[PDB]
């Protein structure tokens, strides 16, 4: 039902900022899981108290309050990209231009655009910092796979200009003007509180430059370390820190085990949710490859179908969830975590849980077939 889920999801006092749920995609629908048991600026959300599918042991999920005050910068960058004339000639290796990628995302409604991920995975950002984060989501959308293009290709010149614009290294088009404003916005927020603003741009530069390794893996860890690069996990962590105005050193070796587990969790959950979408892209030739943890597990262990592969990949997710809670409890018991460090770890798990909630209630992975009512 559409009504029951959306009433019991959040408290009715926050029903003004609550974003309604229109889909309920269950990516474990055909998997044999009968032997797998699951057990300010933000307000709590309770999926386990609704009929929604919830393939995780996590319990804390939150939604950004002023999420509606940020679709403006998301819509702005998209229409500015699709209208830019240089972005119409900046083509990827498959010939599709940046302008069409922006117009393609402008077709899906503002409710379920890719910037809605930030609403659930960066829930702690205030009204101003979420605007800058939602803008960087569009930068990821646009400049994905832009490292494949050569330096002198027009996409390589556009991407290299975007990188120069992010360092703060002459008429400027309106799109360059808005990109300038975003870069300046992060510097302004860093002056106020925390130093994660430059890190987000820095790891965004690292995303446009670092080429991922080749595409077949002898172990699952070989895949997940490549997938840590693919999902832009260092960038993702920098937004978590920037969302709280934090100054934590994300690269602290004390946090390296639990943060690598968070990337493993985010990588497996996303690959589980998007397998059916990604499988069809290889079936009808829409994509040349098939990179996914479900397919990797099916091959590495000779499972006869993707249904059994989803069951084992889901088993690994619940294993990582257990290690995450074990590692976090050990860090808390040892007293070696500062209050700003545990607040960042709490928000990192809100990214892992919010990654599951959106992947269930989005149209990106369930299509129209999972529509409620
Ligand atoms: Mg991806
Ligand atoms: Mg994917
Ligand atoms: Mg998508």
* Residue 373, domain member (yes or no): no
List Cβ neighbours of 10 (8 Å cut-off, separation of 6 or more): 18, 43, 44, 45, 46, 63
> Which one, of 231, 159, 165, lies nearest residue 201 by Cα?
165
Tell me, in angstroms, the distance from the centre of ligand 2 to residue 242's CA: 24
* Phi, psi for residue 226 in degrees, rounded to 5: -70, -40
Are 252 and 344 a contacting pair, CB within 8 Å? no
Tell me, in angstroms, the distance from the centre of ligand 1 to residue 230's CA: 6
Q: Which ligand is nearest to the CA of 278?
A: 2
* Residue 371, domain member (yes or no): no
Q: How far apart are CA 214 and CA 227, in angstroms?
A: 11
* Residue 322, domain member (yes or no): yes
Strand partners, 63: 43
Q: How was this structure determined?
A: X-ray
Q: How far apart are CA 64 and CA 117, in angstroms?
A: 10
Query: In total, how many domains does the chain have?
Result: 1
Distance of CA 106 to the CA centre of its chain: 19
Q: How far apart are CA 138 and CA 40, in angstroms?
A: 25
Identify the sign of the CA torsion 82, 88, 90, 96.
Answer: positive
The DSSP bridge pattern shows strands 42-45 and 61-64 to be antiparallel
Tell me, in angstroms, the distance from the centre of ligand 2 to residue 135's CA: 21
Q: How far apart are CA 372 and CA 361, in angstroms?
A: 10
* Residue 372, domain member (yes or no): no
User: What is the 3-class SS of the chain, one letter each residue?
Assistant: CHHHHHHHCCCHHHCCCCCCCCECCCCCCCCCCCCCCCCCCEEEECCCCCCCCCCCCCCCEEEEHHHHHHHHHHHHHHHHHHHCCHHHHCECCCCCEHHHHHHHHCCCCHHHCCCHHHHHHCCCCCHHHHHHHHHHHHHHHHCCCCCCCCCCCHHHHHHHHHHHHHHCCCCCCHHHHHHHHHHHHHHHHHHHCCCHHHHHHHHHHHHHHCCCCCCCCCCHHHHHHHHHHHCCHHHHHHHHHHHCCCCCCCCCCCCHHHHHHHHHHHHHHHHHHCHHHHHHHHHCCCCCCCCCHHHHHHHHCCCCCHHHHHHHHHHHHHHHHHHHHHHHHHHHHCCCCCHHHHHHHHHHHHHHHHHHHHHHHCHHHHCHHHECC
Two tokens, residue 186: 């992060």
Q: Which ligand is nearest to the CA of 226?
A: 1
Q: What is the extent of the structural domain holding 153?
A: 2-361
Which CATH number does the domain housing residue 110 bear?
1.10.600.10
Distances in whole angstroms, Cα of residue 135 to Cα of each of 45, 164, 239, 271: 24, 17, 12, 24
Two tokens, residue 54: 């919830």
Distances in whole angstroms, Cα of residue 23 to Cα of each of 18, 26, 111, 130: 15, 10, 11, 24
> Which one, of 140, 48, 69, lies nearest residue 353 by Cα?
48
Tell me, in angstroms, the distance from the centre of ligand 1 to residue 236's CA: 13
* Residue 353, domain member (yes or no): yes
* Residue 342, domain member (yes or no): yes
Q: How far apart are CA 129 and CA 245, in angstroms?
A: 9
- If you search the block for the tokens 């699709």, which residue do you land on? 82
Distances in whole angstroms, Cα of residue 127 to Cα of each of 41, 42, 66, 193, 243: 7, 10, 5, 15, 10
> Which one, of 133, 129, 116, lies nearest residue 354 by Cα?
116
CA dihedral 331, 332, 334, 340 (to 10 degrees): 80
Ligand 2 ion: nearby residues, β-carbon < 5 Å: 274
Greatest distance between any 2 Cα atoms in the chain: 64
* Residue 58, domain member (yes or no): yes
Tell me, in angstroms, the distance from the centre of ligand 1 to residue 271's CA: 8
Q: Which ligand is nearest to the CA of 358?
A: 3
Two tokens, residue 309: 């592969």
Tell me, in angstroms, the distance from the centre of ligand 1 to residue 59's CA: 25
CB atoms < 10 A from the CB of 252, how many? 10
* Residue 368, domain member (yes or no): no
> Which one, of 41, 1, 42, lies nearest residue 21 by Cα?
1
Are 188 and 168 a contacting pair, CB within 8 Å? no
Tell me, in angstroms, the distance from the centre of ligand 2 to residue 94's CA: 18
Two tokens, residue 57: 């042991």
Kindly provide the resolution of this structure in angstroms, with one decimal.
Answer: 2.7
List Cβ neighbours of 348 (8 Å cut-off, separation of 6 or more): 237, 240, 258, 259, 262
Distance of CA 331 to the CA centre of its chain: 26
Are 283 and 275 a contacting pair, CB within 8 Å? no
Tell me, in angstroms, the distance from the centre of ligand 2 to residue 268's CA: 9
């Amino acid at each position: 039902t559409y009504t029951e889920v959306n009433q019991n999801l959040a408290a009715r006092e926050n029903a003004s900022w609550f974003s309604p749920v229109r889909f309920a995609y269950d990516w474990l629908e055909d998997a044999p899981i009968e032997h797998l048991t699951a057990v300010e600026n933000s307000f709590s959300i309770s999926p386990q108290l609704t009929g929604l599918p919830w393939p995780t042991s996590f319990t804390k999920v939150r939604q950004n309050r002023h999420w509606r005050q940020s679709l403006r910068i998301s819509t702005q960058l998209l229409e500015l990209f699709a209208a830019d004339d240089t972005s119409a000639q900046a083509v990827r290796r498959n010939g599709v231009s940046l302008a069409r990628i922006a117009s393609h995302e402008l077709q899906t409604d503002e409710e379920d655009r890719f910037t809605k991920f930030a609403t659930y995975i960066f829930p702690e950002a205030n009204e101003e910092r979420m605007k800058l984060l939602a803008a960087t989501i569009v930068y990821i959308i646009i400049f994905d796979d832009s490292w494949e293009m050569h330096s002198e290709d027009t996409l390589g010149l556009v991407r290299d200009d975007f990188i120069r614009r992010l360092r703060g290294d002459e008429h400027q088009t309106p799109l360059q003007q808005l990109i300038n404003s975003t870069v300046q916005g992060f510097k302004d927020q860093d002056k106020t509180m925390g130093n994660g603003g430059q890190e987000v741009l820095d790891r965004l530069i690292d995303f446009c430059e670092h080429v991922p390794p080749q595409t077949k893996f002898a172990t699952m860890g070989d895949y997940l370390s490549y997938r840590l690069i693919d999902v832009a996990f260092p960038y993702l962590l920098a937004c978590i820190k920037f969302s709280l105005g934090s100054s934590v050193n994300v690269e602290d070796p004390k946090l390296a085990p639990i943060l690598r587990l968070v990337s493993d969790h985010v990588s497996l959950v996303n690959d589980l949710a998007s397998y059916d979408k990604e499988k069809r892209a290889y079936d009808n030739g829409s994509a040349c490859y098939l990179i996914n943890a479900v397919d990797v597990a099916q091959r590495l262990f000779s499972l006869p179908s993707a249904a059994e592969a989803k069951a084992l990949t889901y088993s690994m997710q619940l294993l990582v969830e257990a290690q995450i809670k074990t590692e976090l409890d050990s860090l808390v018991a040892g007293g070696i975590l500062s209050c700003e460090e545990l607040r960042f770890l709490d928000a990192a798990l809100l990214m892992a849980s919010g990654n599951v909630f959106y992947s269930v209630v989005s149209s990106r992975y369930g299509g129209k077939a999972a529509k409620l009512e």
